[PDB]
Design a protein around this ligand. Structure first.
Ligand SMILES: FC(F)O[C@H](Cl)C(F)(F)F
Ligand SMILES: FC(F)O[C@H](Cl)C(F)(F)F
Lengths: 309, 309, 309, 309, 309
């Protein structure tokens, strides 16, 4: 009894990740085929109906089922519409769309995270007793120049037809509450180049050269240099957070920065201590200089336990 | 006599809080059911009317009352509309919406604020003598990975149908001035993660380490260094202001920063004081040295009386 | 002859002031009542016609005159429309609007300026021989938590019906160049809180401690520290300009910064001077030290004639 | 043979110059008058048609020619449309518009540039054999409290009606390839106030005090300080470009900053030279000190011959 | 059998490249000519149908094939539409458009990159058995004062009609899967001035002057300065990244900055090494001074082999 509808989704561009909103843009076309009461067409050739005309055929009683992108955020930008009406009953709906879609996204592993871009498609009014998805095909471009792309799309789309029970329906009871839903998935990993070389590396180099505070010979030189190193971290904190995507949690890079702030406060506690440890007023040289290769290990080992995954 | 309307609101996403404008975005569906004069439907089965076709039934006189979101800011983006016409009189309105909504929002406890996301729903044209809200259902998705969300939704939505006296009317007098209104409330708190770890903590380390100025032994070392400390607070003031939400009042971090400005201006006053307090130019190294844990308590006390609540 | 129309304007939110464009947003409702040729209504009860149906009645020849917001910038976002048609002739137009409005805005005393939010309403086609405004009512909410509002609405709203002569007309001549215009005024003052505590004050502490450059005892110390003070000002300029509203002129704050810029250059010239004022190559430490209160007073005096308002 | 069209343009606001896009915003009204087939109006008084109704009259065969703003960027926001239909034949089209317009804009003398704001209006479909522009009237308010205005309008609008021959037309040949085009010009200059006091002047004070490095005593003092002077220029470059208009070229202010970078690199090149020029290792203070007026004049001499215009 | 369509594309402005999205905007006209069943026109002169009227003529069965821009991103803003209906059958569609287009864009050689802006035009429904592009003419303005333009368009546009096989179709079989496609390409190179003079050059000047650490005479001086130089580079990274285009990879300038980061970390390592390389702990001033001409040549040699393309 229920009508079988065949869907094909051609994906043109996935662009513009919104990190705070957990959304993304997808441009492509959607195709839908189903079969109805056969029809008299001008010539025994299939009939083509574009854009403003489809509305007219609907007023004469053509059944064109509303298919909703569930995880889209607000009505998508619809390009051209097409009905290809075959004389032998079958009907093809073809539409181009650009829409900003929503999905759960964990950005904690930035810049080395993998994400999956999803489309969720479901009919708006007719349940699986009325309209069901027979099959789903998703086609993607084959990207070869992905090294100039922000994201490396990682493997072909996965498809998934299932049924959804909306328990709370104000309608009827026997199975009038289940709807048939297509789900498209595309896996991807982030192109970590720019973030590796232009952010991670110099943060290391800076945190590195911070240790070279201990090879200054007076105390006065060492503590005062600590305040210029101090400022540099704040500056580097400002630099990253202004360019990196805003998020509600700490990333890898964010943590290196918290680590950089610690190492600098750490030295200030010691440099000030070594000036006062033992009697004689001795700048505990017994302590410093031994720190010239103590801290680069202390930071680098107690820093080797950031396995938050 | 009055028409009874039953409302169901499905909430999909509450995102994009706007601090300055006091708004937030809500994507969902809204459902309204009422019963009218029973009807001839094709088959004794309910009738489904999608989108552009609803306008047609209106011109032939189907009564579909406009229900307005009172606390929206501008006409919402409405996705698919749907009428389900049952033969036994009952009528179901189903429409998807995305809208920017307004409510009172206090951000003084940032990053530890609790908010109320609110919806207020009321008919646009018909009073409670004519149309009244019978009951209200609000459904919320269940967030399990809340550690990657901007906001933690805290408990299920509370609702309240109420009545409103509109004083200034051009209509008539006998009981023609009250309207039926749904009010949905959702409580939520901010995910304080990114801000404790990447803002509060280094502000402490910076504000703490400002104090290590008193462990320099020269006067020249002490006064000149605090000016490097001065630059560091403005840079940190600059960092915060660029990333934290724009507001028309001071937050806690805002106050700590001013305290940071004070702690350093205060210090410059003592350093200059202890050098000329006593006769002969003897540097009062009793005031200094006493300051080495005088300030870590004074600030830590005058900031421990930021109990403004 | 001319139709008297009674207007009521309900204001919900005045938000989103744009300083550079001198615009602001207003959300509210508008009511217009006038009386025409009496009508057949279903029941002796008034007829309610919403949204898409109003357009229909215009085509059957119903007169609904277009009332234009003079100072709106672009087509306002119209929410729900409603006609209330009375059997006794009279007609009530009700529509919700959100719109961006323009008015002259002087921001020179920022953050201590007062602005007035203005609405200017005038019919689009019909002069006052045809359509004139009988009376105008403006209703505004009671801001109770005004300490959490950015703008303090200061006294209830002002109203004023008037007539406007359009000299340059391509029409006729006979007093057909005058139009009936409602002009709503709302005065408001800026909540100067955030800017005092987080901008004016720390700028003071910074400008003040600039003066403590004269209590360094060396010439090298005094001269070299001022270059750091210099850096501290440029830094503070960047903090302010990036956060404060952008304008085509200098504000109060904009000037303080220029003063700090001056004072440091003033200090640099003295600090470099007292090193060469007297013969012997002796530092006129009479001059400096006089400066420990020449600048804190001199700057504070020739800068205390900042009665520029 | 051709229909004469008389145009009136009332300009309400010119705002929002986009420096990078070379565009500017214009709010106003446009009025076009022509004379046609005399007509029956209800009563012997002219007829008014508003908004949605103009379309209806177009369908019963009223000619209202589409007039295109040639240098607009994308379809403009048309507020109200109004048709005034005269019994003696004349037809007056009155429409309010807000649109983003384009013109070549050279911003190289910023902040001392003059721009001319242009409107170009031409019929979309009809040539000068068919439709021609009779006259163009442009009405502008006179902005007198121009001191809070970003731009000083250098007098009332100039116009130029001409004919434009389009080579590549797919139409017919004998004189059917020329179109009637109005060109409105408004001249204006930028108010250099804000940019003089808040950008030009403190850059001068800083570039000036940069020179006060030659008045430090040891070579260590002299060289170590210019690296802080260096940091200061970079801090100031950042301040400007983040607030000043975005462009594809160097401005005046841009160059001042390049000059400051030069002066400081120049001083370092000299400071290091005067230290090793002679044998004995003796400090060549003949070269230094002479530089105390070499740079303050050299920059001020080689910098007042920037007659690049 | 198939209809020949002759296309003309007039390009008005190419503006607003989005580096991240790999998009750019194009304003222009499109003209399409084909010949159909001849027609009786009012007078024996061609008929002009504008905008809303074209819509009407379609509903009575005028064939106007919808032509889609393949690589536009979202529904472009259609300006005026015009049908010119000739009596001898031919039909000309002319419409103005503004749209955002996508193409692969490689920005690695910034600011010296070349881009080609492409337009790809193809019918939405009709194959080359039904509709084909006969010829394509492309018209571009001649940029004469191109020195104020961000992009230099380099030569006339190249065009190419070709045919496209779509494999995955549910439609017909005998040659029914191929579509006709116009492809326009426009070459352009970037105006490298502003980025050369305001970014590359002062970056050189700073990276150079960084080297002058080796001419300070104390170890204390040389090392403490490296930390101030360190700060200057972080500042300069922030300035560039905030002003320059966002990309997913490192550019030439991004590389210069990493080099400055390296050179400074390089020196810190040597300065600290030269202090302990030799026995006695005496500063190996042999290594130093040799470094005064090691780095400007070493950096200039191993950095002139960044021919990475
Ligand atoms: F306040 C400062 F941080 O400003 C900039 Cl980044 C510095 F350090 F270069 F001066
Ligand atoms: F960074 C260096 F310039 O050192 C500190 Cl921040 C200054 F500016 F005070 F000199």
């Amino acid at each position: 009894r229920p009508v079988d509808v065949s869907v094909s989704i051609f994906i043109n561009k996935i662009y513009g990740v919104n990190t705070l909103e957990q959304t993304y843009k997808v441009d492509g076309y959607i195709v839908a085929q189903w079969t109805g009461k056969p029809r008299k067409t001008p010539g025994d050739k299939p009939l083509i109906v574009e854009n403003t005309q489809i509305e007219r055929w609907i007023n004469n009683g053509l059944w064109v089922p509303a298919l909703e992108f569930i995880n889209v955020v607000g009505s998508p930008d619809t390009g051209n519409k097409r009905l290809m009406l075959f004389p032998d009953g079958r009907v093809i709906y073809n539409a181009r769309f650009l829409g900003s879609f929503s999905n759960d996204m964990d950005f904690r592993l930035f810049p080395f995270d993998r994400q999956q871009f999803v489309l969720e498609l479901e009919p708006f009014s007719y349940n699986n007793q009325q309209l069901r998805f027979s099959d789903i095909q998703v086609y993607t471009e084959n990207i070869d120049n992905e090294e100039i792309d922000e994201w490396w799309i990682r493997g072909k789309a996965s498809t998934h037809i299932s049924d959804i029970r909306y328990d709370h329906l104000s309608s009827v009871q026997p199975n009038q509450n289940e709807f048939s839903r297509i789900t498209v998935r595309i896996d991807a990993v982030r192109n970590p180049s720019y973030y590796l070389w232009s952010f991670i590396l110099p943060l290391g180099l800076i945190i590195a050269a911070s240790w070279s505070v201990f090879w200054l010979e007076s105390f006065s030189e060492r503590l005062q240099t600590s305040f210029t190193l101090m400022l540099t971290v704040v500056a580097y904190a400002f630099y990253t957070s202004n360019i990196l995507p805003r998020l509600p949690y700490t990333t890898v890079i964010d943590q290196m920065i918290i680590a950089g702030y610690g190492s600098i406060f750490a030295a200030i506690l010691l440099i000030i201590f070594a000036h006062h440890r033992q009697a004689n007023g001795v700048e505990d040289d017994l302590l410093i200089q031994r720190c010239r290769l103590a801290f680069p290990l202390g930071f680098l080992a107690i820093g080797c336990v950031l396995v938050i995954r």
